[model samples]
Target: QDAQHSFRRLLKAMSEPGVIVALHQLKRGWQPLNIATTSVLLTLADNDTPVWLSTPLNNDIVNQSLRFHTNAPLVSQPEQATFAVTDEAISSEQLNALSGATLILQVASLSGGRMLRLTGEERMIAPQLPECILHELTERPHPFPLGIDLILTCGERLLAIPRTTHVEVC
Candidate 1:
């Protein structure tokens, strides 16, 4: 029941991009796992999803928890992952994987980074993401159904930017 609520919140965020939503605090939240990140893993990763974890999350505790909780298979290669939790978006060279893959990134702040003007969806965002990520999302060539979807997390709040949404960083 608790995990279900977080999934619902994420659904709402994706449907209305640029809007920020906080995940519900679990019975005893995982430390360092932004409540938002935890919720994304719980709600989306399952036995069938191959989740890739970046170096930052290479600790045994983190991997153990994710595998134990979500029953997801952890993969080292980002290219083979269906869902990825990383500090930065992967290089474009490795982005030619199955479409609809989701990337979850931890941002410095949900507000106060840069005022980005999003077109496909916006009130604008201040997620402190790398320039390359913004470049790829806002100005890269991508087939609508073959691009990766993204979610930004900071603390307990999260925001989604699906592939179909056009982003304009100004």
Candidate 2:
């Protein structure tokens, strides 16, 4: 029931950009990875969703849980990744690889950064995104339909920014 609830809340957050969704907490108590990140992987990712974990998040415990619980195949190349997870700042190469990758970034907090106003009537506050990520967002390597989706998580709370939403970083 816990997983089921998280999935529903996560789905709701995906559709409504600014709304913060909370999870039950980290599945199986995987160290280093928090509740929000782990919940997202367990709820959404599967065997076909090739995931690429950034350096800090890549480890034995995470790998084992992914293989055993989520069944998500781990990929080394960013281009092959459908979903990427990281607490640290992501790189351009990863975001630039446009198979419509959904980047789940673990920020320090959902607030304490610039206001990310979505054109879809969403006046949500964004975290302190890395320069490269902001730069890529501004540069527009791909159209909205082809651009990457972003999910920002902190502890058990998370919010999403879908590609269709026009982000005006104010």
Which candidate leads the pack in lDDT?
2
Off by over 4 Å in 1: 25-31, 89-99
Question: For model 2, what is the error of residue 88's alpha carbon versus the real structure, in angstroms, after optimal superposition?
Answer: 3.3
List runs of model 2 lying over 4 Å from the truth. 25-29
lDDT, model 2, position 170 = 53
Question: What's the CA error at residue 54 for candidate 1, in Å?
Answer: 0.6
List, residue by residue over 21-111, the lDDT tens digit for candidate 2.
8886454435567788888888889989999988888899888978898888899877888898876467666667644889888888888
State the lDDT of candidate 1 residue by residue for 63-132, as single tens digits. 8988888899999887778987766545555554534679887876878776777766246777787765
Taking every candidate in turn, the Cα RMSD to the unseen true structure, in Å, is 2.3, 1.9
